[PDB]
């Protein structure tokens, strides 16, 4: 399975997997510190993934930023 | 299964899945603020992705706006 | 499955979903207002997607772009 | 399973799925009009497709053109 | 499975479908009028397809041309 | 989804000949082909080899090649 | 499966598991002291991996470096 | 199944299929007379393929010629 | 099948580590290489990760990377 | 599976299939002249191949040759 | 499933079969002269191999060399 990587450019970022099935809801909260990086995979339990706060992406489709209030 | 990579430029944008199977309607809509990323795939429960509102999208295919 | 990035030029654009089987005919038509993207899949029960209206359309053969009448 | 892009070019255009086994027949002609895109699939039921009229095509071959008589 | 595409370049382009198995014959012949193009994949019934008549033709090798 | 070869015809009687997969080999169906004619032809349960005798131009998934006649 | 590279560049950095599942929780951390290489693949046990300290980080998506 | 293209440079090339199996022998000749081509699989009967005679001989793994004795 | 990763010991004593598949992680088996041998190494049932403590010149898909020892 | 073809660059060139599973042993020695070429796979039973004597060699990897 | 080809630069090159399973240790060492080459599957019975001695190796990561002590 896919896997994306998240780098957190600020302290407190969020990386978030959403429930598979017919619910959608939070099911985790990973809070990653500056300079910290999460490889995380798409999974039987996660089919999306969000990101808040400053974080450096990339996935099989490139690099993409999340930026924070 | 293949995903869709999104990115809102504005607050309030709405990833929408529609449903897999003979019926077709909106089973959830995710609200992302500005600067927030959604990474989703295509899955048993969602066949199509509708994104109202502006935002940056990344696909197999290359980069999209929607507006 | 392959799926169809469409993204409306115009209001009412129409993505319009035929059905796998024997049989052919419309099954479900998805209205886009301008500058909304539909991401779809060819699925169990939609095996052709027709685009009326102004669109800008990528698949996995390039970019082609509908024109409304 | 694969795909063809139809654009028509002109008014008219027929896209038709002939049947797949032993016998060979049209089973359903889809009629495009001017600008209209047709995405469509072989499948189960379609194991061969002719266009009929003046279209832009797009396959995994590239690009070809149908001419109307 | 894969396919061919055929754009007849002359009226009476025949597209012939050779059956799959032991025995090999023609079981069908898609008549193609000048400008038509048709998109034909291999299937449990067709392990071959023959072109006669002058068509321009795409496959996964590239370009070839049938000659009239 | 086998692989195939594509085989023009450069003069008449071009001859695109199966040989029989299995244990025995030799050929079990033979096509001609006039000049200009296009054979698309897979391997397959019953074909394992494809032996093409007279002028013809080739293409397979390893390049063109052109066979020449007698 | 996929597998991730990670060399340490600084003493004392921890490469996390998260466990596969409905939870989601550390289950192992591997100390890299400065120059030791890890070669790490995601596996029924470990769907997420956490990389703390100063890291060259290889995966099929390109370079990343972790900060300390 | 892989296959290999044979092109006869003279008379009297033989391309010669090896059994499958724990034991190797040879169990065809297939004779090739100058400018005729073999486009010949490994199988399960046939799991090398000698040449011998002057030919030119492409593989996935690019051109080689076989020089006459 | 399985990937692989190749290990060059660029100077004595080089030690390249298998870590146990499952549900428990330690070392299992720890291979010593000398100066100028060459390992390569597949992830298997029994081994999930693979852990490199030495100078060494280290191949994997994603490209090379260099161990260094203390 | 894959193959390895080979080429032989002089008289005697040998080429030997060494018996796949617990036990490894020579099970067959081909002998190629000079210009012969041998496309061979691996198979059920050859799980590694030697080859001695000067010849060319083309695998997916590229090529590599043998010397006497 | 990977082979490794392995081309001995000097007589006594050791290429050694390391077990596949819950145990590590050597099954098989084969000698190789100088010049010869040997190609080389990772199979059931062998997860890793080992070279001793200078060869030239190339596997699908690219060329490395081993060298003698
Ligand atoms: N529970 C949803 C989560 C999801 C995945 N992709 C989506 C796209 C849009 C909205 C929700 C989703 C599902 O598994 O299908
Ligand atoms: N319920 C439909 C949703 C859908 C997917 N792709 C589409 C294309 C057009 C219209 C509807 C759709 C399906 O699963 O088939
Ligand atoms: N019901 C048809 C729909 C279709 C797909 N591709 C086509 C091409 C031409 C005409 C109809 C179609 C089928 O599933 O086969
Ligand atoms: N009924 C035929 C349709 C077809 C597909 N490809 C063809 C090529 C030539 C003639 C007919 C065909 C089949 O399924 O095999
Ligand atoms: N009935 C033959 C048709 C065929 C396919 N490819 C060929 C090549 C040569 C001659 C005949 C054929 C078969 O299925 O095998
Ligand atoms: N009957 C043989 C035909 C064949 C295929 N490839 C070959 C190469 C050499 C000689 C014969 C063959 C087989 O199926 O194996
Ligand atoms: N237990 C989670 C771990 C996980 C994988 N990817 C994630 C992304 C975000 C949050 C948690 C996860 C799972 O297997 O699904
Ligand atoms: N009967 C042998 C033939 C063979 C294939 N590859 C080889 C390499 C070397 C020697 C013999 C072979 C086998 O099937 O395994
Ligand atoms: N026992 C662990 C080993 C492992 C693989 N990848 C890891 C990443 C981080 C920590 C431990 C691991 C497992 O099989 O999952
Ligand atoms: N019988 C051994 C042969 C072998 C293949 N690759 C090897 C590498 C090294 C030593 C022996 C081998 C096996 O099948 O595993
Ligand atoms: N017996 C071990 C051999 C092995 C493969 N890769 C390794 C990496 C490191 C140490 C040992 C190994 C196994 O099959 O798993």
């Given at each position: 399975?896919?896997?994306?990587?998240?780098?957190?450019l600020?302290?407190?970022?969020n990386?978030?997997?959403?429930?598979?099935?017919?619910?959608?809801?939070?099911?985790?909260?990973?809070?990653?510190?500056?300079?910290?990086?999460?490889?995380?995979?798409?999974?039987?339990?996660?089919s999306?993934?969000?990101?808040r706060?400053?974080?450096?992406?990339?996935?099989?489709?490139?690099?993409?930023?999340?930026?924070?209030?």
């Amino acid at each position: 399975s896919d896997f994306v990587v998240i780098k957190a450019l600020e302290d407190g970022v969020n990386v978030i997997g959403l429930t598979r099935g017919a619910d959608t809801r939070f099911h985790h909260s990973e809070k990653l510190d500056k300079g910290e990086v999460l490889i995380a995979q798409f999974t039987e339990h996660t089919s999306a993934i969000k990101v808040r706060g400053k974080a450096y992406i990339q996935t099989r489709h490139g690099v993409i930023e999340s930026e924070g209030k």
